Symmetry: D2
């Protein structure tokens, strides 16, 4: 009884932080009827933003036309406004008809700080493109978007790694039950790393290092905070990251103990059965470049599955790919579209 809108009823969106996720989100929204970006806010002039939309190192040239104008740029004819406002509270989203804001700066990933968008002459609601702590409903599309009723003011699209891990973990539990698990994600370097060795503004002595010239260990909360997405796994998973020199493209390895004894084929079959728009399945021996730009939020790879049986005991290894950029963004926009229809 959620009374969703048709794709003909156009919900106007604003993007805060026209960065990697911001710009790719924008690109995907071009092919989503009933969702339209009318305003972008960042920290720079429209010329910079127009150029970065047209040309993209890892995701290819923009499919369309982009022409710069005063206070914005035109995309296939349609003007989009550009503002350069550091404070979310100072952004007059309402003037451009924006109901929902994509918070994609990385600096306001908190209920308190995201709410700052909602005010007189501002936006109605906000989707954070990152974990927003617990306090905020955290959604991995096609895993737990049940949880949305449309009354929420602030929601999170979770992290890149969470959207990869969730379907894979859920499938495991639903079929065999998960006792505990440790995760490693071999991850592309990202914009929060230094291009060369230098002082890291967040105090991280590893993200301080040249990201495109090192294997760089780093912490991730995605495994710990999986309880926010699959409640019956709360406190059962932990993990970490190894950041490596590819500009996008990642993979998540999970090592787990299960309640049921399993064989490799049963695991792969279970994953194949769980496949959908969000969770893909493959038996081809692919590498990271092969998953750049894919629209699955997670792509299980059967060729890497391991089931080790020593004495009575079993360790199970399951691996899924994800383009930390497009995989996440695809999920984000699915979630945004659904949230826009259901919005109160």
């Amino acid at each position: 009884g959620l009374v969703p809108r048709g794709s003909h009823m156009v919900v106007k969106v604003g993007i805060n932080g026209f960065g990697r996720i911001g710009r790719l989100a924008f690109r995907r929204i071009q092919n989503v009827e009933g969702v339209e970006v009318t305003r972008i806010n960042d920290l720079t002039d429209p010329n910079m933003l127009a150029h970065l939309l047209k040309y993209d190192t890892t995701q290819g040239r923009f499919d369309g036309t982009v022409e710069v104008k005063e206070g914005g740029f035109e995309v296939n004819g349609q003007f989009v406004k550009v503002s350069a406002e550091r404070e979310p509270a100072n952004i007059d989203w309402a003037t451009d008809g924006v109901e929902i804001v994509l918070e994609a700066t990385g600096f306001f990933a908190s209920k308190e700080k995201a709410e700052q968008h909602i005010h007189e002459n501002g936006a109605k609601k906000v989707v954070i493109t990152a974990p927003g702590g617990n306090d905020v409903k955290t959604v991995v599309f096609n895993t737990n978007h049940d949880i949305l009723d449309g009354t929420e003011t602030v929601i999170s699209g979770a992290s890149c790694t969470t959207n990869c891990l969730a379907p894979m973990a859920k499938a495991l539990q639903d079929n065999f039950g998960v006792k505990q698990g440790l995760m490693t994600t071999i991850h592309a370097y990202t914009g929060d790393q230094m291009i060369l060795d230098g002082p890291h503004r967040g105090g991280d002595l590893r993200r301080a290092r040249a990201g495109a010239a090192n294997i760089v260990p780093n912490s991730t909360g995605a495994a710990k905070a999986i309880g926010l997405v699959i409640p019956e796994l709360n406190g059962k998973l932990d993990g970490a990251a190894q950041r490596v020199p590819v500009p996008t493209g990642s993979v998540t390895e999970l090592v787990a103990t299960l309640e049921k004894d399993v064989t490799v084929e049963e695991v792969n079959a279970a994953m194949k059965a769980a496949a959908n728009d969000s969770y893909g399945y493959t038996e081809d021996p692919i590498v990271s470049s092969d998953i750049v730009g894919i629209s699955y939020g997670s792509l299980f790879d059967a060729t890497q599955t391991k089931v080790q049986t020593v004495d009575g005991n079993q360790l199970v290894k399951v691996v899924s790919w994800y383009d930390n950029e497009m995989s996440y963004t695809s999920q984000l926009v699915r979630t945004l579209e659904y949230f826009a229809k259901i919005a109160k």
Copy 2:
């Protein structure tokens, strides 16, 4: 002074050579590869990842001089055709990657050939496989062919042994996040070994790949035979690797106990650090394995424990350091 020959003056061959400069009683008098001395001299002088050669290298007829001393160079495809004896070589380093087998390595041993061979890679199950300071006990000096194991084995072994000796290991799964190597293609292309993943551009991809190091650990630590398995993710750094092990133990542990056990096991071969380092920081190190306490994890869910232990290794110099330790010791006991 025991005179050594190198077959395959490649990454491991050239670094082995470099280390032998600072090992008294071991001397390389002959190199065999598939090319002229000029190529080999240049590749010794200049090294992308391991820096300029510390010394002088001048090309000559049929070889080159290193700090004055001439080293002979031959270009012989067949090991059986290499007259090692003429240059006084008793032990050969087999480092080509093409003769990693007892049958094929023995081919070096003949009339005017070598007495013994050390393979710079896993050889068969019928060859003694040595990780220095872990199981070099196993050598008596009568062996004709030995293996220095793989890069990953020398990293994993001390870490695993320490775990067992202190807490006992039920089972374990390993992932090594590994530098790309010369058996990968620089760009997408047909892989001569039939591997559809090593066929891909190695410096532009995360590339999954199999490794037997975890399975064949029994050859080094017999009491772990059949308890470990694992795999690799090859990534774009030209050298430098790290080994992650996830294990169940017989004893319940804490993070601090694990780190302490590792620290206690530290020596020339197994290093210990609490600094939050990255791969470039371990390029050129002489430890075969370097435990990193900052990455240790002990997860306790209900009664049950999963333990995670991580050690760095320069797949190049770490392995090579161990190889030369093993070579030195094997040379001095060669009865």
Copy 3:
């Protein structure tokens, strides 16, 4: 017209991909040194050029592409390849090992009627940069060259310069992607090159190129006027060609850019956007002039002119190769 590919490598596989969208040209046979499973996989998946747009399924002695079977053989010697059995008239010689009239002719026997070499062939072979000198083809030739990657980039740019202002002399530098003839890590180079021996994805690597010297084969009125060299750098594909020249006419920056813009077509593109190498990966221009890098230096009376054009050493070259192949197939 039925075509065969010898060497299903970077250029071979991309040529194949482009031929999917060329009506009247069809690849019925591939020869390499490996099993069909390897070749099918490498066609489907491509690090730099993206997933294959279509379906590929392996079978006995070949694979099916969107239903249609393509035969695969693994024959080391060109003379032993029975091209005729699969209806092949023209062979793309793309192995890098038979870039010579003598060695390319080895395909013609029964076998194939004609051959296009995907690289500089001898001085006794017609060397074609499409939309620059494909005039030179009459269709009677048995062996032709599609030139090098850097030649197809340089030619339109140089021709435009001469046709408008006249070229006295010029020096070229191409900042070039690393290629399959470099070592992934420091190691013995089979061709004896001490620089291609070095890890290609971790070094700026100087290297020689004959494209500037042998431009006479494409633009005769520039013969002996140009020389140059390469700096190979760590990107897996994508390159750029810088030319520094003295001209007969005094020029301004705007006149040069305008001349280039006027010369623009399917082969020679023009842009004023400040792009980088990734932006030209997969483009179909053989050369893409970049006005933002143009320089005209006037010291005393004298002028040095700098002109720069991008090219995807992979797809740019391949696009030109297939244009040339299509046109050559139409004639006989």
Copy 4:
């Protein structure tokens, strides 16, 4: 016994510090940056491109100890607020990239501040710009603010000077194939300086970019003023660069004459090699410029000659070596 302070403990700051360990009579007693000592100590110990620090480093309150000796660390955004004098600092290395101007560098000089400043980058005009062993003649020791020039200038200068002194230079165009640097974005993103090319992922692109080193060579070799221009192609190596110069000369030359002239000009600052090396081979070298004879070209078409000369430089250590030579000499002449 001259005490130095470093402003901006970055790539050049930290390598300068490292080299000063092996310079008697020069000692760093204070570092100012924008972060805690723990970050700076770690970045000194461990260095992706230049290797582990040769010595011992232990963090302390308000600083760290290097081989026993304490060095103070402050985190002061404004140069005018840095009390350099309290730690005995006479000369400051301005290495932040934000104060490369006489006006802005002078802000270091005040009551309880420093006496003099060396900018690790091109400063204005009316700042003396020094490439060691090329034009350090120009220093008398009375100057308050000096520039150590750019990375590319220290590479180009000895090469160009040698050319003019032997054959005379009419004009020239330069291309430097350059390592990516900290002013590029790690991934495509808004560039604070408005550069649409430095906005792009620096380790995944060939990135064209402008450089003034060729234009402003007149500040170092006056008799070349207005004769040279050039540009850069930034490429994916984390350090290590090479400078190509194409020139017309007053004299007709052969390849061998050019190489010989360069060899004759060789010294501590300008090196000479005939080995076919690549960029990694010059990482960490102490030459400010390293001529490579294997890349020399002399093209003669009709009567006319175009001459090509190429020299390597580690934009990091090559520059830094020159900077410290210049700093040492400037400290002794104050």
